[PDB]
Symmetry: C3
Subunit: 336 residues, 3 copies
């Protein structure tokens, strides 16, 4: 497609929503290829990542950790306006794993405080894909400070299973998983810093242990629990997109399954089925499709259970509806 051809394509401006929600889209593409426009301001901000009050200086695309999910269709163009406000102290950029060239866009989007840039790429491959910050020489520090999210490049025809049957979800959630490396004092208590750069040396030491102090969903321990639990109903079809930009994870729906799981995240790779626990390598996104059959509380976890229940990587689903005794029943309740 020539420059003139692309200029004639229709533009749609998308308003992003905060994870774990996803902006309005259609599963099946409406019309021909479009240039889909997004804007994100990068915020360097203090975030609290557990109930004790532990804080991190985060790099937060659109002001959240993870950054928001951008959704386009195959052969659309994604056109991102990225802004680094003058209140920030560091240079930032963006690497789209969905994109082709210039280190995923990273080499073309280095913006100092008070600068902006507009990057356009053709989303040639269908799937979910990580994006993250990657300033040369400081790449892992920015990513494990929360500077990451994902996009979904839907097939123009929507999702299908491995054999041509249409899969249509009723709702979608995006779970970004973040490994944090928080320095401690000699008493074992987490340290606080005045500016991001003050934490650098101490944080690099922790990073080198390859052992996160915290592993969280949506930026904090318990962020997707309580009144922030994800919800569904018996019979409802849900797609769960999960990303990890730096470190392996193994998602599991406690009480459910992944009926179809694109564990590599790429829709031209047929999904695994009937999954108990799937595996997403660091630097990737995956997606899992499930139809709820039972009501009640579910936990969605990284099934290294230490990571889930000691380090923070557990969310809840609240599910409404009628219990199915054929699928499961307590023949004898706990009794003497």
């Amino acid at each position: 497609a020539t420059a003139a051809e692309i200029a004639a394509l229709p533009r749609q401006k998308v308003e992003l929503v905060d994870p774990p929600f996803v902006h309005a889209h259609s599963q099946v593409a409406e019309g021909g290829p479009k240039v889909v426009e997004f804007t994100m301001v990068i915020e360097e901000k203090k975030i609290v990542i557990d109930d004790a009050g532990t804080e991190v200086h985060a790099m937060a695309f659109n002001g959240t950790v993870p950054g928001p999910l951008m959704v386009v269709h195959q052969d659309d163009y994604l056109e991102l306006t990225l802004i680094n406000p003058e209140t920030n102290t560091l240079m930032h950029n963006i690497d789209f794993h969905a994109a082709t060239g210039a280190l995923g866009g990273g080499g073309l989007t280095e913006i100092n405080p008070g600068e902006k840039t507009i990057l356009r790429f053709k989303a040639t491959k269908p799937g979910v894909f990580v994006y993250h910050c990657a300033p040369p020489g400081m790449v892992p520090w920015h990513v494990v400070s929360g500077g990451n999210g994902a996009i979904m490049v839907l097939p123009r025809e929507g999702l299908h299973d491995g054999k041509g049957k249409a899969l249509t979800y009723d709702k979608i959630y995006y779970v970004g998983e973040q490994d944090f490396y928080v320095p401690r004092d000699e008493n074992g208590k987490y340290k606080k810093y005045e500016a991001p750069g003050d934490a650098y040396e101490d944080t690099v030491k922790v990073m080198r242990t390859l052992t996160p102090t915290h592993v969280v969903f949506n930026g904090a321990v318990g962020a997707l629990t309580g009144d922030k639990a994800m919800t569904a109903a018996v019979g409802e079809k849900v797609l769960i997109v999960h990303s990890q930009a730096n470190r392996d994870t193994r998602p599991h729906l406690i009480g459910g399954h992944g009926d179809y799981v694109w564990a590599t995240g790429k829709f031209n790779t047929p999904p695994d089925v009937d999954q108990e626990t799937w595996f997403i390598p660091g630097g990737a996104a995956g997606a899992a499709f499930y139809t709820f059959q039972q009501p009640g509380i579910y936990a969605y976890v990284n099934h290294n259970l230490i990571e889930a229940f000691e380090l923070g990587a557990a969310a809840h689903f609240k599910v409404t509806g009628e219990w199915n005794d054929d699928l499961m029943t307590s023949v004898l309740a706990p009794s003497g």
Copy 2:
């Protein structure tokens, strides 16, 4: 319907200790059945290495791992779980094969002196982890040995990707356990009077994400020496492998995984000709192999530090005739 489920046959099955598996048929015998199992949970001090290191283990049916239960797709598994009054802790069970109530965990919380009976329909074919999961103390029970697996065979037995039958002559269940044993200032592993005394010290070790031991069948060397698994040349063997908490990467040294259901799910077509497969923590996998050479094999987690320094190494002793076409020493070690 309600009448139809109640009229299905009930069948009690006697369990056996890993790595062996109780009696079953690969192709389902009859229509759907309710397969009944009973397991008593034993809290017991087990020795896990050659230095006398102890762990207060949670042992479904008296073993780490708990035994393999085997049913067919659309059978019901009906487990009676018993927690004797001599135990100190509440326990329960989460079947990854099951649907609802946190895998059954929500319905099976039994204090010492209690029992429960859980039924679920095995709707999905594959091998699946089960483990204890008391709310608020889930990892502690699991890394204390409270885990095993089940196999839900397709009603028509196993098949390859093109649909030809795969029929094993024997089956072994290897449960892999990451343990996190506290050490004192001098580097000696600590011992405790009761399970709860170890809790605080153990969680500290757990948070390093670095096991002190990684073992098969509950201890370093449990499946080596005189306890090696066996086969013969020409024999087809299915090896079911589970890890309820932590990744592993099985490898049969001297062999391969001819077909590997690496995700453990039989509606997902098996990978083939595998050197080393990968099972994420929280899952089981299964590998089918036909032995072609006699001799000693090692079956390991192929992080070789985990295998040979931390304990995740088993043996197969295989009888039969050596095949010089497949391998031959042209010139033996010589100066």
Copy 3:
């Protein structure tokens, strides 16, 4: 085949080349089955693995870490002459994951200094496969000292995608990824030793933490950057073989993709497609096929970014050609 049948097959002596290059070979088999002869001399040598002058006592098959890629076709015989020179101090051997019996050949190739052996095995299974040293009682030590490489057993008809279309590479590269465990003194400086055995006790202690001090490609930090950057051009099809004999890795071509990825490394298992980041478990090799579409510098990494950019696991590709503005364009360059 009988012993007589094998004796009658053509012999072909191959001359090995150092990683990341691969010796001359045909993708499609030239003729019927042959016995492909290789020779390698094991060298115990010091290698410097970072810019702080950190040393490892390496076990180098053919003088390199990793050892070289050996290439045959399915149902050929690989015949290795392995030589342990008198100048070495330790017994060594070799286990081919591609082979069947005697612990991959390890039980038949145990050679003290001043000894040699010849092993022949039938390459019955197509794929990329680890090989490594494994002296009973000292296995992990030899492997994490650099005693590993890989082979490729091509299908006789070359590579194909999942539907039987031919996949033919113009270039091939072999990246061996190595986890090292280097002891430190009490002030954090890496220790040096005058003999391999002198470092055993100290090294075993570090190995037991399951935390490498270094994770590198081709034996050292930056080994595959600068004078040793891999090269390609726009339009060229490139196969990247990647091995890790002891520890998981998650390769990613920054700016690119794995168009087809045999993540398990086995060619009768259909490849994944459109991959961002693939996964190779410790003890295995994998392979990725990609057609370059953009020029410039790509980084090729283990996408645990701490492992890539703090511990050493990053390579570069230098790619010539014309930039493609359809696939990617800077609409607005970084600016106030």
